[PDB]
């Protein structure tokens, strides 16, 4: 039923090449579709990168990436790929793989099927796992949280009690510090009578550093 799934490193060094693959399932990579790449620097607009046509394998990129970019298809594992050489900070963006509607003229312009998007950061900085500190509670309710400090790069995921706790949870977007490291916080409001009896575990995941933490947040 046509699913598109991005795959690739979320951190590339400057001057190195940025490589991404899009796994296509539900149809063949050799069918008459425009397999397309799109990117979006967070907070900014959409950039059209280019496409491969399935039948031919012919590809085209926009005039400003024509000298660093190739989009090709992998017939063995039903994928198409994006390679951007000489990566710089301007190449830091969320990348989307997409599908043009069947048989249309300029199908690469009429994208109805999309992937979830994959953020890749371009920096010389190294991967750094976070430090997780509990934010202990002190009118019928109380606030407690986790502090996820100094990590690189994005992103991290936070859950409470492995998803069992959802009501009153607010996980905040990260701050970027002048150190170049990220920090964020999550907080949850709970009935104060449940402190000391109800276990509260902050689940922190930072995949780039392969770090998984289950922090217990306790009173006193």
């Amino acid at each position: 039923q046509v699913q598109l799934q991005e795959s690739g490193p979320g951190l590339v060094k400057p001057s190195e090449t940025l490589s991404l693959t899009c796994a296509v399932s539900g149809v063949s990579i050799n069918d008459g579709y425009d397999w397309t790449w799109i990117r979006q620097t967070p907070g900014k607009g959409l950039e059209w990168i280019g496409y491969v046509f399935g039948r031919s394998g012919n590809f085209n990129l926009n005039p400003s990436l024509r000298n660093r970019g190739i989009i090709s298809k992998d017939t063995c594992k039903n994928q198409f790929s994006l390679n951007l050489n000489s990566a710089t900070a301007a190449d830091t963006a969320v990348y989307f793989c997409a599908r043009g509607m069947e048989g249309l003229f300029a199908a690469y312009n009429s994208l109805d099927v999309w992937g979830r998007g994959l953020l890749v950061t371009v920096s010389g900085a190294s991967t750094k796992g976070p430090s997780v500190f509990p934010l202990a509670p002190s009118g019928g309710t109380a606030a407690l949280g986790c502090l996820v400090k100094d990590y690189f790069p994005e992103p991290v995921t936070v859950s409470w009690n492995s998803g069992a706790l959802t009501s009153g949870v607010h996980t905040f977007p990260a701050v970027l510090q002048s150190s170049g490291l990220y920090s964020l916080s999550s907080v949850v409001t709970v009935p104060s009578s449940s402190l000391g009896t109800q276990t509260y575990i902050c689940n922190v995941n930072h995949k780039p550093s392969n770090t998984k933490v289950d922090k217990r947040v306790e009173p006193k």
């Binding site: 085209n60 690469y108 312009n109 949280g145 977007p173 916080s185």
Partner: protein, 213 residues
């Protein structure tokens, strides 16, 4: 090939209509019938709403309609709802086998009730202090509209150093949220009466305070 030009901002009232413009040239929008419109919500993939100038994809509301006149394409949204609040991008085929995007238009739906920020201030954890570091955490949420200024105060004297503050961001209830961090030495933390975080929403100021105990 010049970029397609959209108005950055556009607004409308619930139940009313809104028209968004995309201006190109005689050799893209003017020459071809390959204009597409995309809807994008925060942290999601954009979604095809209009293609081929006038056509709607499967499962797109009749409230969305596209047209063009000369070098300019237009997206019309009738029966305006709060869920239509998103970023909108136009696109067109351009010769040399490429597609051109517009700069995008942010659609605001009017009539959202004002909200005051809920503020939660956290003192440095014992574990962080034992690592010879100190961080204050001011969490701001549920405010509308999304404009907030943050002031920190050692005792009652202003402090701007060691202060990092995020931009606001839209929550799942259309309210806004933000956070502010104050980095400190355990010395500065211990050697003060009380640190304070005050949040100024449009006019009013909410303040929270922690103390080294």
């Amino acid at each position: 090939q010049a970029a397609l030009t959209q108005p950055p901002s556009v607004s409308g009232s619930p139940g009313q209509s809104v028209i968004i413009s995309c201006t190109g040239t005689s050799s893209d929008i003017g020459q071809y019938n390959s204009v597409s419109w995309y809807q994008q919500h925060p942290d999601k993939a954009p979604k095809l709403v209009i293609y081929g100038v006038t056509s709607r994809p499967s499962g797109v509301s009749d409230r969305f309609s596209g047209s063009k006149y000369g070098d300019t394409a237009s997206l019309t949204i009738s029966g305006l709802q709060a869920e239509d609040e998103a970023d909108y991008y136009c696109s067109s085929h351009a010769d040399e086998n490429m597609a051109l995007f517009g700069g995008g238009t942010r659609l605001t739906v009017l009539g959202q009730p004002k909200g005051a920020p809920s503020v939660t201030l956290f003192p440095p954890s014992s574990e962080e202090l034992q690592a010879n570091k100190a961080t204050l955490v001011c969490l701001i949420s549920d405010f509308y509209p999304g404009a907030v200024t943050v002031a920190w105060k050692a005792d009652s004297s202003p402090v701007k150093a060691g202060v990092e503050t995020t931009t606001p961001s839209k929550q799942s209830n259309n309210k806004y949220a933000a956070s502010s961090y104050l980095s400190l030495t355990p010395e500065q933390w211990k050697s003060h009466r009380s640190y304070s975080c005050q949040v100024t929403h449009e006019g009013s100021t909410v303040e929270k305070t922690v103390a080294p105990t």
